[PDB]
Design a protein around this ligand. Structure first.
Ligand SMILES: Cc1cc2c(cc1C)N(C[C@H](O)[C@H](O)[C@H](O)COP(=O)(O)OP(=O)(O)OC[C@H]1O[C@@H](n3cnc4c(N)ncnc43)[C@H](O)[C@@H]1O)c1[nH]c(=O)[nH]c(=O)c1N2
Length: 459
DNA sequence: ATCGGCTTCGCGCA
DNA sequence: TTGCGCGAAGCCGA
């Protein structure tokens, strides 16, 4: 039995007599899954089978092959891991509000379970689902270490107000995962799906002049197994010097975990457990935990309590006041979406970062902050900057379309979870970042040098 | 309370 | 490079 405040009753009803169906969505993995572990639990009590259903919405069209290969290949692996433990996996195509409801009837599901996501479109779908089912319907936070609706009931103004809260709750929720018990009872194509999708997304590929792709797909092998190794090599090779090199992009000293945590291919709670027991720097473990605990989960807190998380209106009062005061200011440059996208600005280090984004699908965490603040400076308005920053983040980051994306863009452009700094023209009081500031931190000429000879080779 | 502390910004200066 | 003190800055929360 697991901690019962990880569950929240979406719909009450009378328990069916069919199997218990887990509607996977955020947490695409079989280990370390409070949503899967809970569903198994209530099917063993009901003495019924547990099964997984996954829905494949048209959303893969609003991004690239890169994200879809990465996630489809992952699911190809999960489906096998699940049938190992005797748990069937069903793959729906279409709109959840309709297809999940149909499945719930067509298999005679006795209880519905899902994982937790704060993006508006899950609440939309869930709310259709509730309407068309009669069975009970459960939702489990399987993504955060502390259930979002439990760490805080309000928008948290800053990391230092969240932090005493989150940490006062870890002795309760930071625990080991039990074993996923195979099915005892035995209930009664993703190859085409992955081909069909790439023939669709192929006319939109990001190509170089010579028509081979920009994207390089060997930096991150998708899937649960590949993720475990990225966690272990992190703990053994990179964790010890994270604190002191987090900010250098010429070093590859990050965890590189974010494509995995986004597709739920690995549990942040598992990471935390392995980091905690590891014996590296106390400084570095502090650095690291605060990014995967405080910053990650306050990003869910943000989107969960501010339905306008991808818009201007969600900036803090002072932020908007300041930015409106400077809408009339003359911008040093202005660039269009296309120009940013193609890395055609005056700033070679900015374009360098953009080139890291296009070719690899994961931009360095420090360069990300620089990236968005310089979009605000050379956009024609704050709204356009947001719109540009979201469109390029979500289109090219393997970890895009994610609460961290919005809560990081908002931190960057609109000062959300941050404070006021010295007033500038165009960018108001938003924390400024400078090219020369980057030079006191790392060897910009190497970072630039790495992605040079790719703007020329692309168009 | 009223007032200390804040993702770790940039920049001078040693 | 690297570290320190400083400056400009709105406000939570204890
Ligand atoms: C403009 C902009 C845009 C984005 C983001 C930040 C900024 C300023 N982020 C957040 C952060 O840049 C990103 O999570 C890390 O670079 C992920 O790479 P690593 O896992 O290697 O980092 P690293 O190992 O240093 O970080 C560990 C984990 O902490 C979390 N994290 C780190 N910094 C964070 C931040 N500022 N906000 C929220 N979570 C943070 C992530 O969960 C990350 O996996 C984001 N993240 C993401 O997952 N998807 C995205 O699309 C974006 N987009």
């Amino acid at each position: 039995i697991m901690n019962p405040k990880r569950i929240r009753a979406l719909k009450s009803g009378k328990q069916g007599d069919g199997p218990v169906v887990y509607w996977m969505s955020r947490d695409q993995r079989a280990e370390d899954n409070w949503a899967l572990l809970f569903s198994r639990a209530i099917a063993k009590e009901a003495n019924v089978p547990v099964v997984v259903v996954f829905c494949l919405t048209d959303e893969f069209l609003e991004a690239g092959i890169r994200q879809y290969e990465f996630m489809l290949k992952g699911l190809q692996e999960l489906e096998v891991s699940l049938s190992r433990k005797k748990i069937p996996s069903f793959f729906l195509r279409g709109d959840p509000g309709e297809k999940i409801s149909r499945f719930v009837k067509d298999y005679n599901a006795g209880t519905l379970v899902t994982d937790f996501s704060p993006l508006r479109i899950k609440n939309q779908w869930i709310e259709k689902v509730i309407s068309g089912i009669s069975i009970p319907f459960f939702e489990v936070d399987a993504h955060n270490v502390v259930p979002c609706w439990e760490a805080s009931q309000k928008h948290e103004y800053a990391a230092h107000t969240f932090r005493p809260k989150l940490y006062a709750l870890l002795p309760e929720f930071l625990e080991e995962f039990p074993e996923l018990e195979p099915n005892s009872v035995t209930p009664e194509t993703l190859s085409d799906v992955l081909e069909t999708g790439v023939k669709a997304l192929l006319p939109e590929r990001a190509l170089l002049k010579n028509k081979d792709p920009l994207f390089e797909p060997w930096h991150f092998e998708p899937g649960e197994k590949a993720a475990k190794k990225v966690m272990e090599s992190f703990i053994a090779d990179r964790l010890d010097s994270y604190g002191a090199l987090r900010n250098d992009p010429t070093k590859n000293m990050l965890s590189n975990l974010s494509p995995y945590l986004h597709f739920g291919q690995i549990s942040s709670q598992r990471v935390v457990l392995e980091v905690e027991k590891a014996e590296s720097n106390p400084g570095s473990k502090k650095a690291f935990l605060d990014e995967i605990l405080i910053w990650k989960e306050i990003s869910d807190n943000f989107c969960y309590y501010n339905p306008g998380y991808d818009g201007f209106e969600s900036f803090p009062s002072w932020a908007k006041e300041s930015l409106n005061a400077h809408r009339n200011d003359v911008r040093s440059h202005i660039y269009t979406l296309e120009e940013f996208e193609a890395g055609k600005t005056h700033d070679p280090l900015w374009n360098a970062s953009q080139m890291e984004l296009l070719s690899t699908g994961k931009m360095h965490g420090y360069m990300r902050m620089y990236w968005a603040k310089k979009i605000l400076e050379w956009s024609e308005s704050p709204e356009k900057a947001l719109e540009i920053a979201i469109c390029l983040n979500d289109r090219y980051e393997l970890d895009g379309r994610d609460p961290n994306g919005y809560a990081g863009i908002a931190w960057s452009i609109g000062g959300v979870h941050d404070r006021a700094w010295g007033e500038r023209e165009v960018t108001g009081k938003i924390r400024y970042m400078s090219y020369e500031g980057c030079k006191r931190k790392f060897d910009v000429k190497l970072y630039i040098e790495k992605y040079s000879a790719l703007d020329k080779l692309a168009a």
